[PDB]
């Protein structure tokens, strides 16, 4: 387990059947959190899409801009599709 007086703990529910508690500052940018999921899970950000209360969290929108709090849940869904251009 982990802990930290500073920062909020969010649960990332994967489309598989589980959830992982991630650590990220509330002032940080959304993208920041995603990265951690791309380096931990290996899944590409462009794919990983977290939605809250039915809203797409941008990258330039801090975790606060929306109003996210600690002990919150985040749904993960891979972009259903694939382009012929892979870089």
Curated annotation (Swiss-Prot):
Domain Ubiquitin-like: 8-81
Induction behaviour: By type I interferon (IFN) and viruses.
Expression sites by tissue: Expressed in most tissues, with the highest levels in primary blood Leukocytes and other hematopoietic system tissues, colon, stomach and to some extent in testis.
Role: Does not have 2'-5'-OAS activity, but can bind double-stranded RNA. Displays antiviral activity against encephalomyocarditis virus (EMCV) and hepatitis C virus (HCV) via an alternative antiviral pathway independent of RNase L.
Subunit structure: Specifically interacts with the ligand binding domain of the thyroid receptor (TR). TRIP14 does not require the presence of thyroid hormone for its interaction. Binds MBD1.
UniProt remark on domains: The ubiquitin-like domains are essential for its antiviral activity.
Similarity section: Belongs to the 2-5A synthase family.
Protein name: 2'-5'-oligoadenylate synthase-like protein
Species in which this protein is naturally found: Homo sapiens (Human)
Record gene name: OASL
First and last residues shown, out of full length: 434 to 507 of 514
């Amino acid at each position: 387990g982990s802990s930290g007086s500073s920062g909020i703990q969010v649960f990332v529910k994967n489309p598989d059947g589980g959830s992982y508690a991630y650590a990220i500052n509330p002032n940080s940018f959304i993208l920041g959190l995603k990265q951690q999921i791309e380096d931990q899970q290996g899944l590409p950000k462009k794919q990983q899409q977290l939605e809250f209360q039915g809203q797409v969290l941008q990258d330039w929108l801090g975790l606060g801009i929306y109003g996210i709090q600690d002990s919150d849940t985040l749904i993960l869904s891979k972009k259903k599709g694939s382009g012929p251009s892979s870089g």
